[PDB]
Design an enzyme around this catalytic site. Structure first.
Site, short mmCIF file in Angstrom:
data_model
loop_
_atom_site.label_atom_id
_atom_site.label_comp_id
_atom_site.label_asym_id
_atom_site.label_seq_id
_atom_site.Cartn_x
_atom_site.Cartn_y
_atom_site.Cartn_z
N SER A 140 -52.09 -12.51 -66.58
CA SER A 140 -51.42 -13.70 -67.09
C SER A 140 -50.39 -13.88 -67.03
CB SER A 140 -52.16 -12.96 -68.66
OG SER A 140 -51.66 -14.22 -69.32
N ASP A 199 -61.95 -19.58 -67.49
CA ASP A 199 -60.64 -19.16 -67.47
C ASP A 199 -59.75 -20.24 -67.39
OD1 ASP A 199 -58.14 -17.52 -68.62
OD2 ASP A 199 -57.81 -15.77 -67.01
N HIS A 253 -60.42 -15.21 -69.94
CA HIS A 253 -59.29 -15.05 -69.50
C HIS A 253 -59.33 -13.06 -70.43
CE1 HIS A 253 -54.90 -14.66 -68.26
NE2 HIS A 253 -54.47 -14.89 -69.46
#
Length: 265
Positions: A140, A199, A253
């Site tokens: 991320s 994602d 995610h």
């Protein structure tokens, strides 16, 4: 080209996704221990140092694997990821080392806060184990800082080059415009950008804003059995994950290869 990833390539990407996942455990950063459920995978690495910066809350660590002959750099993503997603705003600014390129200000400020000390700790370890390789990984937000870190290391031209410096990212958002992506490809650094199905983070900021991804795209298209499609191009293509846009997922995610990434669950 489009090809399927090999068993060995899935094994390596799950290893880096674990290091990334582990970094969200407060006993790992800033605890500096391998006291977590999935820590058993990396518990033989010697933790050199950890950081939790004051203004940007940049969480990272330097670890050394002797049997692996690798010096590891790990960046954590946000400690409140849902919220991080919901509020991300992109502010294109010049990237200093390379004239004509722009990066999101917020990623440069995050890295910027740990840079000095981190880079000195990695050169110190590399001067002591010059034969080792240097691997950077982050999920991320951590994926964006990981990329800026690897470019910084290559730019110090200290013996770190495309042959012993590797970058692995999971769920990383785009970091700069086309010009900055070209620059990244020009370094030749082996860059595996992993995307977990739908994602949404790898699709932010919207295609329309002007940013573009560099790094060979490893797209997990299925989890049982685990299946990965590789778009071998070093620049972003419409053939891997971009094919599902705009039908993205926020929950995709939070898990890569079966590992909770973001909650140290």
């Amino acid at each position: 080209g489009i090809r399927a990833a090999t068993s060995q390539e899935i094994n390596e990407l799950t290893y880096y996704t674990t290091l990334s996942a582990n970094s969200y455990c407060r006993t790992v950063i800033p605890g500096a221990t391998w006291d977590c459920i999935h820590c058993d995978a990396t518990e033989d690495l010697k933790i050199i140092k950890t950081w939790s910066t004051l203004i940007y809350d940049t969480n990272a660590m330097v670890a050394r694997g002797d049997s692996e002959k690798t010096i590891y750099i790990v960046f954590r993503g946000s400690s409140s990821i849902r919220n991080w997603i919901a509020d991300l705003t992109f502010v294109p600014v010049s990237y200093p080392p390379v004239s004509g390129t722009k990066v999101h200000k917020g990623f440069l400020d995050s890295y910027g806060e740990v840079q000095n000390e981190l880079v000195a700790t990695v050169l110190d370890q590399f001067k002591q184990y010059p034969s080792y390789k240097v691997a950077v990984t982050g999920h991320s937000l951590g994926g964006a800082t990981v990329l800026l870190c690897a470019l910084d290391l290559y730019q110090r031209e200290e013996g770190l080059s495309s042959s012993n410096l590797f970058l692995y990212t999971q769920g990383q958002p785009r970091v700069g415009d086309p010009a900055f992506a070209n620059y990244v490809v020009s370094t030749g650094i082996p860059y595996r950008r992993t995307v977990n199905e739908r994602d949404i983070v790898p699709h932010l900021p919207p295609a329309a804003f002007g940013f573009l991804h560099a790094g060979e795209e490893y797209w997990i298209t299925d989890n049982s059995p685990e299946t990965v499609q590789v778009c071998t191009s070093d620049l972003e293509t419409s053939d891997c994950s971009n094919s599902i846009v705009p039908f993205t997922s926020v929950l995709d995610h939070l898990s890569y290869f079966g590992i909770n990434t973001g909650l140290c669950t």
